[PDB]
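#struct-pred

JT: dropping the chains for the assembly here, can someone run the whole complex?
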Amino acid sequence: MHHHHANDTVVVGSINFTEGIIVANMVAEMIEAHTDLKVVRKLNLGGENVNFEAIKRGGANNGIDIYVEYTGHGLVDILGFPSSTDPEGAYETVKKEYKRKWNIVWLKPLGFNNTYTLTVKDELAKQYNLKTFSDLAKISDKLILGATMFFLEGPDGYPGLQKLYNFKFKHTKSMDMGIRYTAIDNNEVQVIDAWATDGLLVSHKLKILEDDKAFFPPYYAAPIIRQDVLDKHPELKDVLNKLANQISLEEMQKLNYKVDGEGQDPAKVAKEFLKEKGLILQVD
Ligand code: NA
Ligand code: NA
Ligand code: NA
Ligand code: NA
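RK: done, full complex below.
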């Protein structure tokens, strides 16, 4: 699964994915509050690999200098390595390899693991004492999965997950857009797929289950930056590392909800979050 549908200038990128826009705007705000660097906020069109192609180009070549990447995307999709089960091993691997291959520096994780998950209504989890994918698999022969199309079409999706856990859902319905949220609300399906930080989980009274057999890789978000930009502006390392461990899963979910559920401006959501925990000053 993919996370998509001194007066010099630094270019911060994201693609059109709510979480990505929010965290990219946070990165921009931190640079604008703590340095005199000019920040271009580039919204790249296309899938998430456009960010990787852009960072290899660099802001000086109509690309970008910084974006927020997930450890497992770098590990599996970019480097082609197997899906590790250890967050630290995954992080150290991408950090070492990105530095060696492309002179790209992984900074510290933001604090959340936006991994792919299966979710059920809180009420179902309470009724059947569900915590893990393995718990769900045991009762899956009574249940229906409503899932995004890409999750059903791929060995890294439900087919592979089904093999590892022996899922036996009666039906697996392809439901794009917001169809599966309405379906689970209506008890037409009993399980949906979602990113762990999906802004709709709390408002739909949904519970994320644990991938106890570790099918999915770690997906810890962290800023990554070109070394040549750090060479010119070494102060960016400490400025951006002020975000280290500053965004929990629950905090990120709430920000995604403000945008996707409440229609708030992601730039305002990002800046207000930083101001409310003192990461920028009240007058910044
Ligand atoms: Na690195
Ligand atoms: Na993180
Ligand atoms: Na099935
Ligand atoms: Na806050």
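JT: nice. Residues 18-34 form the longest helix (17 residues). Residues 1-114+219-284 form one domain.
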